[PDB]
Write a protein that binds this DNA or RNA. Structure first.
Ligand code: MN
Ligand code: MN
Ligand code: MN
Ligand code: MN
Ligand code: MN
Ligand code: MN
Ligand code: MN
Ligand code: MN
Ligand code: MN
Ligand code: MN
Ligand code: MN
Ligand code: MN
Ligand code: MN
Ligand code: MN
Lengths: 99, 97, 106, 82, 99, 87, 94, 105
DNA sequence: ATCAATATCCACCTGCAGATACTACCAAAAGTGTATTTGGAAACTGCTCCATCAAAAGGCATGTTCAGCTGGATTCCAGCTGAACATGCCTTTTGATGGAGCAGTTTCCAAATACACTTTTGGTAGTATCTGCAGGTGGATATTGAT
DNA sequence: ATCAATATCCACCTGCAGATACTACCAAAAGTGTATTTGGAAACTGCTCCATCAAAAGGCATGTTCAGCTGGAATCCAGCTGAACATGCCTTTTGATGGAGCAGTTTCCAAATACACTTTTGGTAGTATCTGCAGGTGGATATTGAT
């Protein structure tokens, strides 16, 4: 039989891998694309410093990682190990980001 | 000895109350709340305008700083209307003398 | 005959006082003439907005006098005022009646 | 292929974010939920950033514009000036 | 034959009662003693304006009420109707009061 | 000339019925037995932090009397702004 | 062309005093600059409010101190107060 | 002529701190002691972080402090973490931490 | 228990991007000295309001009994999500290249500040008198729960 | 559904605390006018750095299969927690008194601002040398999962 890791094993491996490193985890150009599109709805023909986009990605990724931590606690609170939209919503509600 | 004068926005809040609800009064405790509200929003807008002027190396807070500060601080429709009422008041003020 | 800067601006709120508070508050070296006018207008507008909704809340409760509870009801029931005052506590205001659906009997 | 920009924020990239957040198992609906949350965040910050740009009468969003906007939203960021 | 409301009926009546009113729910004098005890442990021979104590009580009650709201959402998230210490802790962690 | 009685254990003046009432206003239907001591602990931390800051304002002003403003300023900087007592 | 001020060379001096054989990347230096600026603003801002609250037009070492107590956690505040008191004493005598 | 920093026994620039204070519109006046005290507090805080971050570099077998080391120092220190609780360090990443219930067996 | 498949770690190596050490140049900034102004500490004290008192009383806390129904444990299984592999698509690199526009410099005037003098006003302060509604009662309607 | 116990509703009323009303007073505020200063807008422009372009290179995202195991549904039951009751204590309320200490007013000098002048420094720009460590290698060995 060809080798195969149990479900959850590789995931735990990835957790250790990414909690060890600091590199950004969203692709640069797709992110740069998203930012410019959103900015366009506020003011037309804008240009961006490269450091401006980088500041945005760092702040945005750090925000999502922290949010995922809270989300994880909410899932575990409900005796699950799987995070659900239910969990993200509860975290954001208690954070005061909504409702 | 005279106790020093304690300023508040009460008589102005009251005026606006009569414009908006001619047959409605307001308790002193509720007036207390309204006074806290005006002072709070005052400090918020003024503080934001202060930072704004400093980020742009300006030594003058003009109506333009106040306006941007209002856009930063207020949400949606509130910003829209506040800006309009502010612009209106300034144009009127300058159109005199 | 002198005209107040408030009447000159067509405002109920005091332009003179707002200009004075701006200078005394150490926000910048200089304060332009349009700044207290604009600010007084914004403050007055916001005051009108809240008093409008609080007056309605009072009326809804068969009262003719606005009390803190009415101010709280008006603020928490308006999505935008709630956002602006999201980190503010209204003394003697209480909370909105709100029972999570799952708590009701069936 | 026709492609929306928020859909450019891919499932595997969202997965890596969750991993750094210490998340072991992810529901299928998470990826769309995340993108929506991402968008609101970016909108809120960029709006304030552009507002600083306009006030300075510029056509270029600077790192400082972003840094100031982040500080407004209580998301103070170190390392990009200020 | 002696009348009894079912468990939960009176609790719901009480929720409606106190969500309708605005009065302070902690007894005044005991709260004042607590304030003086705590302040004394920080600095001796302090005096209090009466409105200062009331300012503290208005803040403390509004804080706890808001905390119980979040706590309630945490218990419901776990498919319970009964709030527990672990709900309070979860809400305070996500709030960033312990994180 | 004379001293006041010793203040101790006053956290228990925050009774179970008082905590139940606060939970009701917060929309809580059912309450575990361990909530009451947990709540007292949480309340004490909140109170200590606000009072510490307030008294710090008091001392800086070289006063012996904690004012409502001291409390309000303390609440403000803790991110718990309070309307109805203040400036 | 104009110049841009930073705390870099002062951060570097302090580094060599605590870890003489340790270097620091430019990215890490950017972070330290953000740190110094942030804490400066926090302390100055709090000192400002203190003066205003007490109807004072002067920010003195006393305001900086109360501000430090309000802003820094226990032990960090203790050492900071001591370091600040020390520097003002040595500045008075020298 | 001896600088105020030398006169105060400080590495941080007192004159600059004083100038930043009065130009920041914090008050009408600034006492001579205030920029000394504030410069001292800032230098001390800088030292504490650089010390802890330096150790973090040592532990990682590096001689050069990078963002990651600053993050490790701050988040592993109870008081520094509290002081900088609402601050994100660019390129800092997070602390290694896995909830127990997620571990196998 | 054995045993094979991968992941992971350690030791060493090398190219280079980023750190460093140097010399020179200069505008701004920090130190020095002097003359002038003034904020706020001291002293004195009027007077608000805080601490403490007593005393009566009923609203409410405490403690117990009782059992309804909630939480927690257990089992079970459909199906969702992780792992792995096969494609192939587009992000990344980097290097050059206009040129947009940030930013530096010069000019200069509308508007700000400083100041002296005149007038208006909002804030007590002292009484004097309405009035909205809290809280009481009573009796009609509604809700809940047993049967 | 019927009914009985109990909460809820609402109209009515009365006491009164708190809101409204007036005059008198006045210190500070606000407004006017003149003179003097200057912030920053405007116009022009050099140089930074941003957008775009090509163009492989391939790393990484996407689609599919299979099944391990997780989430959710169902079932049971011990016992926790809610409801109701009896008891009586301690909070609440009302009013008074002394005096602590907050706060208002005035005198006054140490310290801060304001200039003018001199000197030092930190940011700078080239210019050249140096080095910590990322990234690649191999081989040891730890981990995982099949038996
Ligand atoms: Mn004690
Ligand atoms: Mn004076
Ligand atoms: Mn039973
Ligand atoms: Mn159940
Ligand atoms: Mn051009
Ligand atoms: Mn008047
Ligand atoms: Mn009633
Ligand atoms: Mn000029
Ligand atoms: Mn199966
Ligand atoms: Mn399971
Ligand atoms: Mn008893
Ligand atoms: Mn005395
Ligand atoms: Mn030098
Ligand atoms: Mn390596």
């Amino acid at each position: 039989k060809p080798h195969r890791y149990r479900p959850g094993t590789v995931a735990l491996r990835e957790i250790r891998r990414y909690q060890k490193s600091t590199e950004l985890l969203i692709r640069k150009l797709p992110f740069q694309r998203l930012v410019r599109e959103i900015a366009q709805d506020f003011k037309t023909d804008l240009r961006f410093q490269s450091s401006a986009v980088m500041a945005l990605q760092e702040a945005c990724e750090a925000y999502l990682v922290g949010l995922f931590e809270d989300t994880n606690l909410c899932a575990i609170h409900a005796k699950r190990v799987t995070i659900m939209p239910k969990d993200i919503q509860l975290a954001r509600r208690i954070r005061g980001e909504r409702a | 000895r005279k106790r020093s004068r304690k300023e508040s926005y009460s008589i102005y809040v009251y005026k606006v109350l009569k414009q908006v609800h001619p047959d409605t009064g307001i308790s002193s405790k509720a007036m207390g709340i309204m006074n806290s509200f005006v002072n709070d929003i005052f400090e918020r807008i003024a503080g934001e305008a202060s930072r704004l002027a400093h980020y742009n190396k300006r030594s003058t807070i003009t109506s333009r700083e106040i306006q941007t500060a209002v856009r930063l601080l207020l949400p949606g429709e509130l910003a829209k209307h506040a800006v309009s009422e502010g612009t209106k008041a300034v144009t009127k003020y300058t159109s005199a003398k | 005959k002198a005209k107040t800067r408030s009447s000159r601006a067509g405002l109920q709120f005091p332009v003179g006082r707002v200009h004075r508070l701006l200078r005394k508050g150490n926000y910048s070296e200089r304060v332009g003439a349009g700044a207290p006018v604009y600010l007084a207008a914004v403050l007055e507008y916001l005051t009108a907005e809240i008093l409008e909704l609080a007056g309605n809340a009072a009326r809804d409760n068969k009262k003719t006098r606005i009390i803190p509870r009415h101010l709280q009801l008006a603020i928490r029931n308006d999505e935008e005022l709630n956002k602006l005052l999201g980190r503010v506590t209204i003394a003697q205001g209480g909370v909105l009646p709100n029972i999570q659906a799952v708590l009701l009997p069936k | 292929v026709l492609r929306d920009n928020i859909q450019g924020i891919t499932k595997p990239a969202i997965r890596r974010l969750a991993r750094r957040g210490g998340v072991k198992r992810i529901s299928g609906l998470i990826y769309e939920e995340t993108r929506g949350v991402l968008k609101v965040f970016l909108e809120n910050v960029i709006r304030d950033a552009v507002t600083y740009t306009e006030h300075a009468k510029r056509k270029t969003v600077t790192a400082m514009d972003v840094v100031y906007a982040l500080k407004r939203q209580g998301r103070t960021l170190y390392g990009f000036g200020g």
